[PDB]
Amino acid sequence: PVQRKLDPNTPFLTGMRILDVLFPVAMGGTAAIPGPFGSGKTVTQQSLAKWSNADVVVYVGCGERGNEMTDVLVEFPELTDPKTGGPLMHRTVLIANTSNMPVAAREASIYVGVTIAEYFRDQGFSVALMADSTSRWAEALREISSRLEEMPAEEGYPPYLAARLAAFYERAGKVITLGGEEGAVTIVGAVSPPGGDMSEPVTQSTLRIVGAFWRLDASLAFRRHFPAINWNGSYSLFTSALDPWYRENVAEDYPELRDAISELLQREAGLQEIVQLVGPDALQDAERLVIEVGRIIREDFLQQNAYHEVDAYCSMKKAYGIMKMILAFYKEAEAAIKRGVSIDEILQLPVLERIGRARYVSEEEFPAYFEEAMKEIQGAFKAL
Amino acid sequence: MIQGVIQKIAGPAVIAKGMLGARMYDICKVGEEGLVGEIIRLDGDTAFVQVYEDTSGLKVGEPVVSTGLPLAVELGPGMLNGIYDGIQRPLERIREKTGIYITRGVVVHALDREKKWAWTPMVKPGDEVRGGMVLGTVPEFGFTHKILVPPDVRGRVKEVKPAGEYTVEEPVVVLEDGTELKMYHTWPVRRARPVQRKLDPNTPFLTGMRILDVLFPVAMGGTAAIPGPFGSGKTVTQQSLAKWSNADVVVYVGCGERGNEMTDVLVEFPELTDPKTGGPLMHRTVLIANTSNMPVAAREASIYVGVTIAEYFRDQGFSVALMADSTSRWAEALREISSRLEEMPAEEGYPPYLAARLAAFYERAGKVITLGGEEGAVTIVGAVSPPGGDMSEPVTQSTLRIVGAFWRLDASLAFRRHFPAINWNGSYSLFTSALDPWYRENVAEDYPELRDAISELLQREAGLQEIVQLVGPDALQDAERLVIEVGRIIREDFLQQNAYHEVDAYCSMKKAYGIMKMILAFYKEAEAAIKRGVSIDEILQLPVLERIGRARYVSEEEFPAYFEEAMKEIQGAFKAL
Amino acid sequence: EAEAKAKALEAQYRERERAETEALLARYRERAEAEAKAVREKAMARLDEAVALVLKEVLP
Amino acid sequence: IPGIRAQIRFIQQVLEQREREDTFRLKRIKGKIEAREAEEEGG
Amino acid sequence: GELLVATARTQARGEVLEEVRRRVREALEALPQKPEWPEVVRKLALEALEALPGAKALVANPEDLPHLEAMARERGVELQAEPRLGVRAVGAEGKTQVENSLLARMDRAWDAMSSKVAQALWG
Amino acid sequence: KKEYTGITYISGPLLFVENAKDLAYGAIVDIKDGTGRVRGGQVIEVSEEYAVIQVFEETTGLDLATTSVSLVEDVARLGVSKEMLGRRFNGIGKPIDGLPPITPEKRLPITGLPLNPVARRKPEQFIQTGISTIDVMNTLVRGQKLPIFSGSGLPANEIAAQIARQATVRPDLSGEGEKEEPFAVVFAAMGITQRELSYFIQEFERTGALSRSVLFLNKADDPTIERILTPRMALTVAEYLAFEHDYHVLVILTDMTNYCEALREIGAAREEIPGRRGYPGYMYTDLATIYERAGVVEGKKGSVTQIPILSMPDDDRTHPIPDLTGYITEGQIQLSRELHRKGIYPPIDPLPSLSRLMNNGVGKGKTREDHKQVSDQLYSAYANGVDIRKLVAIIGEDALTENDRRYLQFADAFERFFINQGQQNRSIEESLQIAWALLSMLPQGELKRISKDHIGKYY
Amino acid sequence: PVARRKPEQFIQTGISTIDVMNTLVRGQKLPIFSGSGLPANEIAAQIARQATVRPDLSGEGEKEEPFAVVFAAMGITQRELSYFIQEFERTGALSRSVLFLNKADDPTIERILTPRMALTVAEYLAFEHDYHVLVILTDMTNYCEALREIGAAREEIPGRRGYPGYMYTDLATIYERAGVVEGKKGSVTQIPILSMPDDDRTHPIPDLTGYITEGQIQLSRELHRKGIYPPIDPLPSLS
Ligand SMILES: Nc1ncnc2c1ncn2[C@@H]1O[C@H](COP(=O)(O)OP(=O)(O)O)[C@@H](O)[C@H]1O
Ligand SMILES: Nc1ncnc2c1ncn2[C@@H]1O[C@H](COP(=O)(O)OP(=O)(O)O)[C@@H](O)[C@H]1O
């Protein structure tokens, strides 16, 4: 239990450039991804499980491929905390779980590590929990049902859905205790919808429960990209509380530039459409302007790679800087083209690839990289 | 026997009580026309019957009579030129006796029991045999009807009559264990008559119609089903193939059919003569057809009928062609029947009791050498009623998984009519690989070369359609549109064939190899022509184009008449223009 | 005649090959034949006791 | 436009018809429950 | 060649085990005459009785029938009809024919611990 | 043993006989019947007074007397040997070859035990398949389970045979010995055909690959029931050779499409809801357990190197089955639709083409110290190509920047060559090589995934 | 269907087009595919009396196939029923003709009888009384329609969505008769009139109806627009 209700106001942090950044999310909040098959679900998870801000890592995968976590058992000791370098096994117990184990064990699993999470949250020590797929709950439950032969509601689903969902999350929060110490509960549940069904009971029901939808498309990502979500098939709802916190912490203008960034990122859709209507056959200016811009912004500059050190580990301030490049380029571009410049000449500006190489620049180096990089902007524009 | 009487009715299903110690599936006579059901369920004492006839008007407590055996169908003489059809009963006599109708429950003998036959002993007495020897001939029609020891039947021979004329009701060969071999036997029809070894396609099994063969050759188990919307060609391609074969024996089942669909049909085979010979085609073909005005389930029954006849003959070394219309029957049958018997579904009334049997038809199907040491290869020819008129259906899809080739047909062409309107675009054959010697043996090798070179045309033509509609056939330049109006001809006497214009009706590999080659020329001549700056427009004027249109009016004798003929005329004028 | 050289290459390649394989099975098979007998002969010995042993076990 | 129309429909209809099967199943299920309740309350 | 060699060996081994089977079978079948057959009966008879709570039945060959007049008196208090090397018997109503033939020992064992005898042979 | 009386329900190959209340879960029985034919049943479910039998056969000729029921085991197991090396097997777990059965040298449950995940040695173990397709894209360790979404004319078996011949070790990017890495030819079946039959057989005669060979065998003529049983059978043989004879077992799970079909029947026949498009959902599970047999093994050079194989309905990977199949399995292979038509040998698409292993335990040393970012470039590079394949096909005849020409250009190139293999080797460098050649005409300075060095390195 | 004589004599209709597109003799099914705003009703009526058989053209005197019809109005409207009255009175069509009637209002079941009933009449009189008879019900839309709400009461799955499958069965009974017979100068030509679901050749509603039987006519409302009289399917169109 807790003493009393306390608001979160401190964000979750691990600096994923959208999920965090363009979707500022409470620490005491909890939020979620779905997943069609083999869709990088769990792959997201463990970047987060080291570049967390959290106090306690809490591993469970919910009747999963042994193989897919056989590894991690071994990895995490020889993983490295930032603060301490320690075996991450310090702050985790490991409740990874598999799938010749009882069906019903699959439930137990959840129902244990949630509670454990509480025991610490109680102690003010603040959850990072990750579930591989709540669907496995579904998958179990209604197989109970059947085997007990009780008519389950429509879609072939008995109805303990909201029931066993909504309640559990409500335990969560940034919550002050009888012992004072205030445990946030930061948990991120995946889901396995095999159908893309925003319309699987579980999906939709759970949409508009806990914070921030994020989505998995697959064949996008099948390229380079991860994390494919629809950007405009995701949300944040914590972009007022933490707005203080950012305002100082990073910068006071941090949402100003960031909101200004996302602005384009979706506003661009304006143009997107015409492409799909009639191409960029109108290869023209404020079109193909924007086009490239937003592209780059995501193309690498949201596109972290967990499988690199530097692509996915990053800071606020690093990113913060980065956005400002682009912006910049834009700024001078507005007046470039106006001068009579074609986007053509803008196009082969070499300094843009210099602007690109950031995912290879460590955070210390990052300053100086940036400190330089702003300059070449003004140099590679004003001249012309 | 196993006995008791009736208990309940739920339309053509029945359960019955008084039944105990009861076998599972038999001949179940019931009531006043011995009404021919089946022991499906045994729970308690209580047999789910399912009839194969109309049932109606009845009451509880009627005799229920359970043989102790299910259909094991009389095999042996009288076979060809036959009707036994689905009920198993030969129409002949019946036709008269039941007025002109068909009328329920009307038994007859399942063969012409007292028709004498050409007893040829091949054997001597005292002798030791096995199931599946041949004992004897009855050469009837052209053909040396093997008098099969049936499986499981071995050993001592007591006597062996001398040759002559003997009804099947005479036993001619008494075994010295005491077996009076009368000349037919009963072969459990859901039991597969087995074989010695399954054998291995080597040579196409041809049966006419050009492209179909040339492109989509076959195994000697064969199979492909025809997906085809209503109206489509299918239904009378089998009938085309009624003429055209390479077969030994010729097996036609009409698979639960309506009569007007099938009037001319019935007679028409009797109007076909034999091409291995010249007497009736009936002298090797068999009417096995039965109705849509008897239940579904007797069609289900029908299905087993086909195969088993085939097997017998296949065991008699034969290239057997079976071409059953419509799995929409088979399907349909059980696709209701469960419901009757209420059992658990699967969607679209699919009982997942399903490609079990479908499969099984194929398993039973094959190319083989049999117990008798005798080769044979029953080749099988599926057709389908698409349900939307178009596909969705596992009953097609896994069906694909388990048939040799597949086929695929087009509505639009049907408007013009096209014999066929195949869409290779869909369709394939894999048999394209197993036969390959026999290609270049019989043909020669540039059929395996030229043929791919024919596809390539239409292949890129597909891609070109795009551009045709995307601009016109006009933004185009010379070389493209070449190939475009090539394609037409490739189709034109490849998808117009016809079954009433007599020349049109038959085509051989001779008829093939020839016409493939022609076209090539045109290509190459124009290919050079237009690179001598020429406009293809001029080429249109070739009277020769109609001349190739006379292909299915050229007939095989005249085919090396016409072959060589056009060659030169191409190579002259356009090599000069 | 360079085509001839190549033809000639075939000859020996086909001939020797045939011969060697044609021998190979025979020889091996006959060693099998030999060995086979000799294991029967081993068996003979350890026949009687196996049965004796076997017979006792089943009885109650 | 009309091409893609006809798609939806095709879809729909199947999805929709699914409802029935369910029901069809459920019907029998009810039958079970009720059979139980006839011969466990009766017998 | 190698596959044929393997088979060759196997061919022999099967023959061997198969002989051993024949002998056991033959041997077991020459038991009934012996007075150690009347003795051997009742083991399985009693055992079957152990198997059947409620005992009613019991079968014995016309030769055998004598051996159990002791347990014709006991058991199902019954002896009727003929089994072979082995005993059958029904009990617990009828219903349940639950037996244990010495030949039912055979179909378990022969094949079972076939492994050790074969080991003894080869090895 | 225990012998029983009376039918209680017969209809479908679903059985009941009463007087049974006294059995343990899951039991191999027979049903001797005075027909002269025995038939066989598993006690799939037990009840307090009869139980559910799962018949293996036709029901036919069955009668209320003949009825003799027979405990074979009240559990289920089977024996094991490596005498069963090289041996042929029906699905009934009987070696059909006319060779007298081998002997059990140990015997163990069919289902077998779960496995500590901690105990499973990681996969990481690249070997060379000789097909670039694999050998770049999805990346073949050993352990892996990956499957070829396939169907109509899509030609699994064929392709599988390539592998049957081009399975080959790489001790050599890792400086090892060479007796180290024995595979194990192990073959299984399902539904199978005659036209397939010899075609298969021939590769054991062509590749000698009767070599160490278990081959379970199962057409469809045979009653349905054993389709699903047998997998497990074979799957259990595997471990034995895998740990104890240390193989990198070639696992030939061998379509799985039929599995579910029959299974489902049995299901639902009793009751189980489909819940899923006319399929019981717990299929997942039902196939989970299958796969749950997996792993490189610590302390032993067992590696459960898996080939699952499947058909899938239509083209559609969206179909219920291949769905979860997806979820489960590590790898992921599709054959290109595109390429049957124009006949490339082999027709393989570059679409579900990442697996779950390439970086993780892997990607250099074992590979070589430039590859990753190459591959990683090529992914989106190729995407970028085909993307316009449509857009173009309205908008320009061209109107592209002809840098963007190159992009689309480079697809067709890459494929046309790449996706035809002869009977080649192909090795990691023979790959790379090609790779760079396609990269060539692509300028440097677009290659943002890559760093400057490697590219010009490899011009 | 081994005890009849196939047909050959020719349904002469006063509408060219028909006798253009089709072949139209005397032992067959020709399902007229219809719709709202489609004029079927008239056509069969029109051609009722504007139909003859002329065997003169075939080299037999015209004393020898006698012209009669059946057609009994089921399942149809008020107004629609009330129309055809005078039209009959105009040519003497009703003279040899029976309407058991329903007009869409009397128990469902009636609708399903009167077809085969109407049929069977002729089954006697056609061959036995050697009449050469034209038959064309209307509104087989309603047959299936109603028929399904029948078997609702029996509770087995719809054979397909919104349709019976035990449908097919009946479609035996209808069609598995027609035309001349050995020794008999009857004949029956029995012709469907029912819409497609709207327009839609993709619904078993017509589809299956297709599969089975012979002929196929449609009319084209995309020629109503011009008002072509007759209008037809121009390229689907098949006998
Ligand atoms: N976050 C990521 N960064 C880089 N690669 C990724 C990422 N997520 C997924 N991938 C790649 O895409 C593949 C597909 O995801 P996968 O791991 O199979 O699925 P899941 O996480 O849903 O179990 C991964 O195996 C990996 O190759
Ligand atoms: N090859 C053909 N293409 C188009 N229609 C054809 C062709 N051959 C015959 N027909 C027409 O189709 C009718 C039906 O026969 P068929 O096409 O085999 O099939 P279905 O039984 O599917 O209607 C024939 O009576 C004739 O009118």
TrEMBL record, chain C:
One of its GO terms (molecular function) is metal ion binding. Ca(2+) binds at E57. It comes from the Bacteria. Keywords: Calcium, Coiled coil, Metal-binding. The keyword Calcium applies. This is V-type ATP synthase, subunit (VAPC-THERM). It comes from Thermus thermophilus (strain ATCC 27634 / DSM 579 / HB8).
